[PDB]
Symmetry: C2
Subunit: 501 residues, 2 copies
């Protein structure tokens, strides 16, 4: 069995089918709204991922849709299976050990990618170019009611570079179909616009910055591309470490951008940063579409499309928990949050973004013994923690950091909400930050005047009893698991003898 | 016929009829085993246990009914045990139970009638004086770390002044001190203003007569646990005089303790695992000593117990649920456009969610700060908001009885700190762990806020948004997908 789910997108789909986690839908499904409704029901009931093989309006090769590639399974012993398969791990690997694996791979010999010819690249099996490109003829889904348009890019990656190739970015920004030959998306953050636009303007290409957009990439590549590290690095060398081998890449037909060789679909074209078009709105990670709330975005012209036979388009349909914006985007913030704590010496056992908080919360599980050795206090520790996370790219999406002690399983929201509500004084145990960069997608930000400042609106909430900063505070948790072991063993042994099923 | 609101044993019978009761003849230790069994029944929403074979129990003293206010697994009647306390259909949702308690505040109080001792089942047996040994009863040690065995967790105290102008039914916890004494904080320091002096005027300030009843009519245990009976019943409550004092107790009570109280003979009470999920081991807090002089009880008496802890138990379904009913009544009294009020159990009865009619809110011509201060002033300076440390304002699209929607609106619709309006001069709940484990336990002031989870523009005009779940899709799309769910290939 030469299946490698981390290296090949189709091996990933095959393992899902082998483990009974894939339903191949041959019923005709409408890309308008139906695909979105089906994926939401699969997300929220934690059902097998759908593979739409009979979309309305699809040609023979363009395309099929893989829904819920990062959704959760119902069986808790492997609820994070699809996430683990992105890295080639056992599907029973819990999320805590998936995060620890990502950190242990940062210490590995990075393997750079290698270039393969077009004949050795499955993404080159077909080619559309110029006037034979009609994006409005593709079965692109209208995912949420209220979306400003059909969103082709929800689970692929953009590729952008400077001419000198010193700056290279793999982005996961959303991409909306504008018309027959144009898409749009916010791929270059305002911080990098001058660097990249001036560089291409030097060669008379400032109004046509080459780009590539790839779908169905190796699942390890879409995972790392969704990981919060500096924009301006593919970190494909780190992808190779996770893969244990070199990532095969191939040259675009119309530019010198390198794309994964086993991609399902590859878009090619140029970008005009001065040609602005309305983008969105789009249903997002916090569970909202706000109809009518679009914003100008640079226009991307699509000059070439290369795609595999029987191409498959993975889609993510964001909304309420739990979808990819929580397991993947939130889960990788958790991994970098844990790494950041190790670099600054913060005694953090584990870090996690509870999905019920729509990836707006970052729970930090504090080693209380080491915290007491630091001889600090809630105000001094909360400020330091917030200064580290809210002034880093890792904490950009996070608007509230929760500090809990080492008795709280932060991956279990029943325990998180209990420690949150019972161990922090409202307001008084919240250390506010008014001068940190705010997340524009946060509905309390976008629906407030703070959407025009993008500053503040974040706090570090101490849910550790104040004396626990100095000494152990003894308390017994009043649930079944809180009883002595001999009591729990006796009750479970006699549970049927009592009369319970 | 069966009346679960009027008779504790009709209540048990309906639970048995609805498959919601397991009669345990297996030997169960009152030491920790009863508590561990009840917690597992709480947390897995299993049928309520009826312990008929406890270590140390005599024939008549006693059996234990566990989880009388716990939830059922099937959501269609998850609040059935709470509805049965009032005599409502078991499938009555918690929203309608609250509305029923409100409709009952508009009906005439029916005074109780006295019945002779031979007509009261609680008089079927008598223990008095030297025959009383409370350490021989199978009293449970409910939580590991509790300061002692707690006999009073789901019963009611009865206190009165000699003039009987003041009478009170209390649900304060009661702990066994020794063979003849129990203890508890049954009277709040507000009303000691008139009970010690009144009994001292007769020479009995050193021994205030009390009665402690267990297995009372379930409507009685619900009104005394409510932050304000025969009106709810539709009938006159049958009561009977105590053996050693003039206190009137419910005639159908399972067990009745009688004796005297000394507000000066203070004794360590607690600790005890409570509504927020904690017991903090250590010395107790001084509480007045209660001498037990007489015990009357039915044949085959049953002692209902509550084992507080994490959600969900009686301290969340009843205490919080009745705070919710009074919270709604407060809103109608002050003209606050509240559609529904509820205390999410996942917040351990520390949160009070208010569902705001947005159209009526817009007619008020107000703003988040002005509205939150008004709401906090009304609720945090009332007895109903004493246990509530955070009030949450949400719009009319949120099911506040569904915590998935509450935590979604909470995390996504309020700016941390900036959308929280703090109250530093209100009374704090000393039981709250963030209060008791902080210097605020010496002040009991502040530590509360009203969190506005309504988008600021919604105070002026409608804010259009689509909820990004399956239920947020248009009806025709949702029907299409559900019709075809099996044809797609899904189970």
């Amino acid at each position: 069995s030469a299946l490698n789910p981390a290296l090949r997108f189709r091996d990933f789909i095959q393992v899902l089918k082998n483990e009974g986690d894939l339903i191949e839908i041959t019923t005709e499904v409408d890309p308008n709204l139906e695909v979105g409704a089906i994926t939401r029901k699969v997300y929220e009931e934690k059902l097998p991922a759908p593979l739409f093989n009979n979309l309305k309006g699809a040609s023979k090769n363009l395309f099929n849709i893989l829904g819920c590639p990062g959704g959760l399974r119902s069986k808790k012993g492997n609820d994070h299976a699809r996430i683990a398969l992105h890295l080639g791990l056992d599907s029973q690997t819990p999320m805590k050990k998936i995060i620890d694996y990502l950190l242990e791979a940062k210490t590995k010999k990075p393997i750079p990618p290698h270039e393969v010819p077009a004949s050795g690249a499955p993404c080159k099996e077909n080619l559309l170019s110029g006037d034979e490109i009609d994006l409005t003829s593709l079965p692109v889904p209208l995912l949420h009611h209220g979306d400003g348009g059909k969103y082709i890019q929800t689970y692929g990656m953009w590729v952008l570079q400077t001419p000198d190739k010193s700056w290279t970015n793999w982005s996961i920004a959303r991409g909306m179909v504008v018309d027959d030959k144009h898409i749009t998306g916010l791929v270059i953050n305002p911080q990098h616009i001058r660097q990249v636009a001036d560089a291409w303007a030097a060669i008379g290409k400032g109004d046509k910055i080459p780009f590539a957009l790839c779908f169905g990439v190796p699942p390890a590549a879409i995972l790392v591309s969704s990981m919060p590290i500096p924009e301006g690095a593919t970190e494909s060398d780190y992808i190779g470490a996770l893969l244990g081998e070199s990532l095969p890449v191939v040259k675009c037909e119309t530019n010198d951008l390198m794309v994964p060789a086993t991609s399902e679909i590859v878009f090619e074209g140029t970008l005009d940063l001065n040609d602005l078009v309305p983008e969105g709105p789009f249903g997002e990670m916090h569970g909202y579409v706000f109809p009518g709330q679009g914003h100008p975005c640079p226009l991307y012209t699509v000059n070439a499309i290369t795609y595999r036979n029987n191409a498959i388009l993975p889609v993510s349909n964001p909304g309420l928990c739990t979808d990819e914006t929580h397991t993947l985007i939130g889960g990788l913030v958790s991994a970098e949050a844990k790494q950041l704590a190790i670099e600054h010496g913060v005694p953090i056992l584990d870090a996690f973004t509870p999905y019920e908080a729509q990836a707006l919360w970052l729970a930090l599980k504090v080693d209380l013994k080491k915290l007491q050795a630091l001889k600090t206090n809630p105000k001094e520790f909360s400020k330091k923690v917030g200064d580290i996370y809210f002034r880093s790219k890792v904490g950009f999406i996070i608007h509230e950091i929760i500090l809990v002690g080492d008795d709280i399983d932060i991956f279990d929201f029943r325990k998180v909400i209990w420690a949150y509500t019972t161990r922090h004084t409202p307001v008084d145990d919240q250390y506010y930050f008014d001068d940190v960069k705010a997340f524009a997608l946060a509905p309390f930000v976008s629906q407030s005047p703070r959407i025009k400042t993008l500053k503040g609106g974040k706090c570090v909430t101490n849910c550790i009893f104040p004396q626990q900063y100095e000494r152990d505070v003894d308390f017994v948790t009043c649930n079944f698991d809180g009883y002595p072991e001999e009591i729990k063993d006796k009750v479970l042994q006699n549970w049927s003898a009592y009369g319970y099923k």
